[PDB]
Design a protein around this nucleic acid. Structure first.
Lengths: 136, 272, 61, 74, 38
RNA sequence: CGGCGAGUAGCGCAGCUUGGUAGCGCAACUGGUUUGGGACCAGUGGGUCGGAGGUUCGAAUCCUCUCUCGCCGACCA
RNA sequence: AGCCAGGAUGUUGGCUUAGAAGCAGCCAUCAUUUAAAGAAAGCGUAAUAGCUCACUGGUCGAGUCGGCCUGCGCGGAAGA
């Protein structure tokens, strides 16, 4: 499971999710899934969506995982009165904004990739579409 | 005592059903023509000879053999107390033998050259390994295909006796098992079925459902006979379970062929 | 416990026998015998000598 | 050898006459006798190459009469 | 049959209808494909 | 659950205080002794400090994060 | 879109030779005969056969087919 190995700090602020993401192009391959939503993907979902594709081709093509968690989420232990310190690190997530290219796939005809992304999306929360590499 | 009697004065009515008595488990095994044939007999004793014998289910054998080679396995028995001081040390290696049709799953070739273990002690370890083969380290079921070659060892002057090496062989023996990870062996049957023309197919899947590895179907004027391999566990009730498929028109027969390493689904289901 | 004299026994945990008198002196407990020519332990595999014991039919041939 | 009535794609080996193992109900599904088949098939098998992997077509009529066409190896 | 919020033509001969305004996927060849409420 | 005390050769304890070098007893192998063993006398090897990240010239040691394992108690309606 | 047709030759193509004959899959994913027909889209078999579709003939005779971006609706939608 992808996880930032050995970073600066363990717990970090709740933060905010404003604006538009940076990576909006299909950079590495030929086909890519762009996220038309605005939410927070978890590491669990990431690898899950990976399996749907890793299975969708069985062995052909190259898969690029654009995003990376980099955000630690905590949670208070069950039934503990509020207060008494900051939570305990549970799991990691990667913030998402619209117009972000998440999975970039190359090596297969537009057909299967179109089909492949239909499987990845069913595991991810936010609405996403399928976009292609264009010229400049 | 009167059940052994019960059959003897009921068997007279019909030779069609026969009588056994478990080779290894001392449980009587009833045989017959079908559920209808058997059903009334149960009452024939439950009333005529007063026998509420809890009508169980046919039983099993379930062999067990090693999965792979071993590496060093050695023996060592040292409890001195002065007067006895029995000290015997051996170092064997057993291997998964070739699965062959011969009943020689045991073969101990002596690799020792010189007096590291006295000649008058080969019989002891020889005696040793074979008896433990009736103590399959799951629950004590028939073990075979153990390629044993004794490599090196030692002994104690004046002292060393048969006691040391027969038992010390076993302690070494057990390691080869607790370290090369054996696994069960299930007996396998060759079952031939004559199915006219029409339910042939649907019969196969039933047999296929019984883990039955298909062998081949050969056609004749009336009835295609089928050669089939099936684990004996899946076999109970088959007759009726078959005639209900073939509308009571088929004829199956049973032949043993070989022993198979029982899979997970069946494997753990013996451990107790 | 009782004794079956002669390598002609064929029983395991069942199969009724007959009993006659006589211990064996070396087997702790055994104080009776079997009548070879009885229920579940008939004659000992065709012996011709003193076969009124080990009871096997003589050579009819 | 009319429209599809009574034939199949077989003849594993003409060199082995009356082939049981690999054939089985391949032709026996219809009710085709093997002893009768020895009659005609062997009649020209001796005349032609044998044992080559080669198919034959055997079409049976309604009165229990057949016909064949010996073919080309795959 | 089976009721779902998403009903798709499984077979080739699965058809779509709007009886009573309620979507149905009645078929003509096979029974199991008959589904609705989508 | 939080939270003060342990984690070291095959076994049990040292060494942590104030950082610089891993030890004692028994186990184990070897030899003597004896008719042989036990016992008893001599010699020797064995971990390199629960695992990970820091700080320093230097980390078994001083701090942090997890794990396994004990004790204290998780009370007042 | 309907109504009558066709829809084939080598080719059981290997292998695990038990068996995957257009139809479990692993590879090629052909060329011929053509008005056309894929060494195959689905149903059906142990493995075939049987039944259709792709594409192509004719008839009838006018528009028809599939995606893209949104407005506004249906379903998802069950409590004392």
């Amino acid at each position: 499971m992808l996880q930032p190995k050995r970073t600066k700090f363990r717990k970090m602020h709740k933060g905010r999710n404003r604006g538009l993401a940076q990576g909006t192009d299909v950079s590495f391959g030929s086909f890519g899934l762009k996220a038309v939503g605005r939410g927070r993907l978890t590491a669990r979902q990431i690898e899950a969506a990976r399996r749907a594709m890793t299975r969708a081709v069985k062995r052909q093509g190259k898969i690029w995982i654009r995003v990376f968690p980099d955000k630690p989420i905590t949670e208070k232990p069950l039934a503990v009165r509020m207060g008494k310190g900051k939570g305990n690190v549970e799991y990691w997530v990667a913030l998402i904004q619209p117009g972000k290219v998440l999975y970039e796939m190359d090596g297969v005809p537009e057909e299967l990739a179109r089909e492949a992304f239909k499987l990845a999306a069913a595991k991810l929360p936010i609405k996403t579409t399928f976009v292609t590499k264009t010229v400049m | 005592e009167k059940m052994g009697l019960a059959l003897g004065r009921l068997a007279k009515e019909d030779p069609s059903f026969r009588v056994w008595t478990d080779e290894e488990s001392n449980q009587t095994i009833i045989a017959g023509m079908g559920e209808l044939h058997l059903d009334i007999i149960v009452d024939r004793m439950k009333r005529e000879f007063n026998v509420e014998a809890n009508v169980g289910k046919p039983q099993v054998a379930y062999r067990e053999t090693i999965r792979q080679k071993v590496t060093d396995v050695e023996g060592k028995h040292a409890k001195q107390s002065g007067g006895r001081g029995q000290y015997g040390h051996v170092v064997i290696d057993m291997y998964p033998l070739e699965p062959g049709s011969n009943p020689k799953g045991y073969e101990f070739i002596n690799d020792i050259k010189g007096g590291v273990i006295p000649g008058e002690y080969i019989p002891a370890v020889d005696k040793g390994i074979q008896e433990q083969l009736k103590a399959g380290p799951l629950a004590g079921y028939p073990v075979v295909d153990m390629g044993i070659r004794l490599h090196f060892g030692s002994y104690h002057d004046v002292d060393s006796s048969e006691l040391a090496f027969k038992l010390a062989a076993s302690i070494a023996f057990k390691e080869g098992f607790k370290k090369a990870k054996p696994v069960l062996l299930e007996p396998i049957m060759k079952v031939e079925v004559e199915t006219p023309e029409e339910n042939t197919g649907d019969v196969i899947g039933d047999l296929s459902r019984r883990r039955g590895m298909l062998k081949g179907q050969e056609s004749e004027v009336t009835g295609v006979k089928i050669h089939a391999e099936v684990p004996l566990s899946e076999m109970f009730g088959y007759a009726t379970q078959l005639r209900s498929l073939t509308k009571g028109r088929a004829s199956y027969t049973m032949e043993f062929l070989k022993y198979d390493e029982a899979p997970s689904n069946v494997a753990q289901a013996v451990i107790e | 416990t009782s004794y079956i004299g002669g390598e002609g026994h064929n029983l395991q945990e069942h199969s009724v026998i007959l009993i006659r008198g006589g211990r064996v002196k070396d087997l702790p407990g055994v104080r009776y015998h079997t009548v070879r020519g009885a229920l579940d332990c008939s004659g000992v595999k065709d012996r011709k000598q003193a076969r009124s014991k080990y009871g096997v039919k003589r050579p009819k041939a | 050898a009319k429209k599809v009535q009574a034939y199949v794609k077989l003849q594993v080996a003409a060199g082995m006459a009356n082939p049981s193992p690999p054939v089985g109900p391949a032709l026996g599904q219809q009710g085709v006798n093997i002893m009768e088949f020895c009659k005609a098939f062997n009649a020209k098998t001796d005349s032609i190459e044998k044992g080559l992997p080669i198919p034959v077509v055997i079409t049976v009529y309604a009165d229990r009469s057949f016909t064949f066409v010996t073919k080309t190896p795959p | 049959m089976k009721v779902r919020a998403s009903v798709k033509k499984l077979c080739r001969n699965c058809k779509i209808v709007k009886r009573d305004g309620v979507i149905r996927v009645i078929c003509s060849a096979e029974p199991k494909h008959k589904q609705r409420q989508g």
